[PDB]
Enzyme design. Structure first.
Site, PDB file in Angstrom:
ATOM      1  N   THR A  16      53.207 -17.636 -41.469  1.00 16.04           N
ATOM      2  CA  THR A  16      54.308 -16.749 -41.151  1.00 16.04           C
ATOM      3  C   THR A  16      54.117 -15.398 -41.814  1.00 16.04           C
ATOM      4  OG1 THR A  16      55.623 -18.015 -42.756  1.00 16.04           O
ATOM      5  CG2 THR A  16      56.175 -18.267 -40.420  1.00 16.04           C
ATOM      6  N   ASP A  39      32.946 -14.980 -18.929  1.00 22.74           N
ATOM      7  CA  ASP A  39      32.373 -13.867 -19.655  1.00 22.74           C
ATOM      8  C   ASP A  39      30.919 -13.597 -19.271  1.00 22.74           C
ATOM      9  OD1 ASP A  39      32.410 -12.153 -22.207  1.00 22.74           O
ATOM     10  OD2 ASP A  39      34.240 -13.417 -22.457  1.00 22.74           O
ATOM     11  N   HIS A  69      28.826 -11.213 -26.467  1.00 22.94           N
ATOM     12  CA  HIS A  69      30.257 -11.281 -26.601  1.00 22.94           C
ATOM     13  C   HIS A  69      30.873 -12.505 -25.960  1.00 22.94           C
ATOM     14  CE1 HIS A  69      32.965  -9.170 -23.496  1.00 22.94           C
ATOM     15  NE2 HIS A  69      31.899  -9.648 -22.860  1.00 22.94           N
ATOM     16  N   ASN A 161      41.642  -2.205 -23.909  1.00 23.36           N
ATOM     17  CA  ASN A 161      41.413  -1.441 -25.114  1.00 23.36           C
ATOM     18  C   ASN A 161      41.530   0.054 -24.930  1.00 23.36           C
ATOM     19  OD1 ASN A 161      40.752  -4.045 -25.892  1.00 23.36           O
ATOM     20  ND2 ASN A 161      38.703  -3.534 -26.678  1.00 23.36           N
ATOM     21  N   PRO A 175      51.597 -10.391 -13.789  1.00 25.34           N
ATOM     22  CA  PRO A 175      52.668 -10.959 -14.572  1.00 25.34           C
ATOM     23  C   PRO A 175      52.604 -12.457 -14.777  1.00 25.34           C
ATOM     24  CG  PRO A 175      53.626  -9.722 -12.672  1.00 25.34           C
ATOM     25  CD  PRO A 175      52.111  -9.580 -12.652  1.00 25.34           C
ATOM     26  N   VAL A 177      50.258 -14.439 -15.439  1.00 30.02           N
ATOM     27  CA  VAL A 177      49.298 -14.908 -16.437  1.00 30.02           C
ATOM     28  C   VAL A 177      49.714 -14.531 -17.856  1.00 30.02           C
ATOM     29  CG1 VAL A 177      47.451 -14.945 -14.739  1.00 30.02           C
ATOM     30  CG2 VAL A 177      47.739 -12.958 -16.243  1.00 30.02           C
ATOM     31  N   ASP A 200      52.542 -10.354 -23.052  1.00 31.54           N
ATOM     32  CA  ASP A 200      53.307 -11.539 -23.376  1.00 31.54           C
ATOM     33  C   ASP A 200      53.258 -11.871 -24.847  1.00 31.54           C
ATOM     34  OD1 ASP A 200      54.159 -12.820 -20.719  1.00 31.54           O
ATOM     35  OD2 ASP A 200      51.998 -12.383 -20.406  1.00 31.54           O
ATOM     36  N   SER A 224      39.823  -8.356 -26.489  1.00 38.09           N
ATOM     37  CA  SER A 224      38.810  -9.298 -26.076  1.00 38.09           C
ATOM     38  C   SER A 224      38.657 -10.426 -27.100  1.00 38.09           C
ATOM     39  CB  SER A 224      37.499  -8.544 -25.918  1.00 38.09           C
ATOM     40  OG  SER A 224      36.730  -9.102 -24.874  1.00 38.09           O
ATOM     41  N   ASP A 260      57.149  -9.213 -36.649  1.00 38.42           N
ATOM     42  CA  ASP A 260      56.266  -8.969 -37.785  1.00 38.42           C
ATOM     43  C   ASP A 260      55.338  -7.781 -37.632  1.00 38.42           C
ATOM     44  OD1 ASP A 260      57.418 -10.975 -39.238  1.00 38.42           O
ATOM     45  OD2 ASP A 260      55.921 -12.509 -38.625  1.00 38.42           O
TER      46      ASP A 260
HETATM   47 CA   LIG Z   1      52.845 -12.680 -18.195  1.00 40.60          CA
HETATM   48 HG   LIG Z   2      34.801 -12.454 -28.895  1.00 41.44          HG
HETATM   49 HG   LIG Z   3      34.062 -11.838 -25.045  1.00 42.48          HG
END
Ligand SMILES: [Ca+2]
Ligand SMILES: [Hg+2]
Ligand SMILES: [Hg+2]
Length: 279
Positions: A16, A39, A69, A161, A175, A177, A200, A224, A260
């Site tokens: 928390t 990916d 990645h 990003n 929306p 997802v 979300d 990512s 937070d």
């Molecule tokens: Ca959503």
């Molecule tokens: Hg990653």
């Molecule tokens: Hg990735």
């Protein structure tokens, strides 16, 4: 269970408060569930995967991750040391090239593929799909994501990003997802993270240590990196029977750490993925 000196993101997700270093979690660790990683591919042979990873589809000459990645993402999902769901099954789908690029057409095909393929797998606890990619708004890409979601797969996708509203990005703007934003070690929104009403949830995405190609490790940053934390958390909860593929995103948001984060613009949710683990 407890993982001492865990990567910051794993600890964060089981606390928390920021600044802790132990990742607390249920021993079940997502066993029984499946995560598709759409990916650059996965270096399945990485000892960190313990043989729990498999390539199942490539759209290029090779099935191998020549980028890294994808391997990184998969690692955050369910590697031994760096993963959220330590006992999950990983399936790699190579939609991106070794340069990390991919055409919308290919990405769509990759989503339709998982929707079908899942039917031939043994994933008693549920199926998840993690999509650490995106681009400019496309209604067809959005549509593919929605189909995947409707097929009974928990779809998690990066918010992007660009330090902008995620509404102009696909599949982020879909929306139905689970759109994931990035946070840093200090509970601040990641400087590059997209935001907006379409998000979300936030997951850790700044300076994420995880697996890399050539049997190595690497710390990188991006929405990512956050996405897989959420995909992992979803698989984890599914095996716990807390939630289903259809309602996972909402369950995560409901049970998230609220208020937070800092640097969260008005209109963006202030929710941070949280596992709610209690020994
Ligand atoms: Ca959503
Ligand atoms: Hg990653
Ligand atoms: Hg990735």
């Amino acid at each position: 269970a407890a993982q001492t000196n865990a990567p910051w993101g794993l600890a964060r997700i089981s606390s928390t408060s920021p600044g802790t270093s132990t990742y607390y979690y249920d021993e079940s660790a997502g066993q029984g569930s499946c995560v598709y990683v759409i990916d650059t591919g996965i270096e399945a042979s990485h000892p960190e995967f313990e043989g729990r990873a498999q390539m199942v589809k490539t759209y290029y000459y090779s099935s191998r991750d020549g980028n890294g990645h994808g391997t990184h993402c998969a690692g955050t999902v369910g590697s031994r040391t760096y993963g959220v769901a330590k006992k999950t099954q990983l399936f790699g789908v190579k939609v991106l090239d070794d340069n990390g690029s991919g055409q919308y057409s290919t990405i769509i095909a990759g989503m339709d593929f998982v929707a079908s393929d899942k039917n031939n797998r043994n994933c008693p606890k549920g199926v998840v799909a993690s999509l650490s990619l995106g681009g400019g708004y496309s209604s067809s890409v959005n549509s593919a994501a929605a189909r995947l979601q409707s097929s009974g797969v928990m779809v998690a996708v990066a918010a992007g990003n660009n330090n902008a509203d995620a509404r102009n990005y696909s599949p982020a703007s879909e929306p139905s997802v689970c759109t994931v934003g990035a946070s840093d070690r200090y509970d601040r929104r990641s400087s590059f993270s997209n935001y907006g009403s379409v998000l979300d949830i936030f997951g850790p995405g700044t300076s994420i240590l995880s697996t890399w190609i050539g049997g190595s490790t690497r710390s990188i940053s991006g929405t990512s990196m956050a996405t897989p934390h959420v995909a992992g958390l979803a698989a984890y909860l599914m095996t716990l029977g807390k939630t289903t593929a259809a309602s996972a995103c909402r369950y995560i948001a409901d049970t998230a750490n609220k208020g937070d984060l800092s640097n969260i613009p008005f209109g963006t949710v202030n929710l941070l993925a949280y596992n709610n683990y209690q020994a």
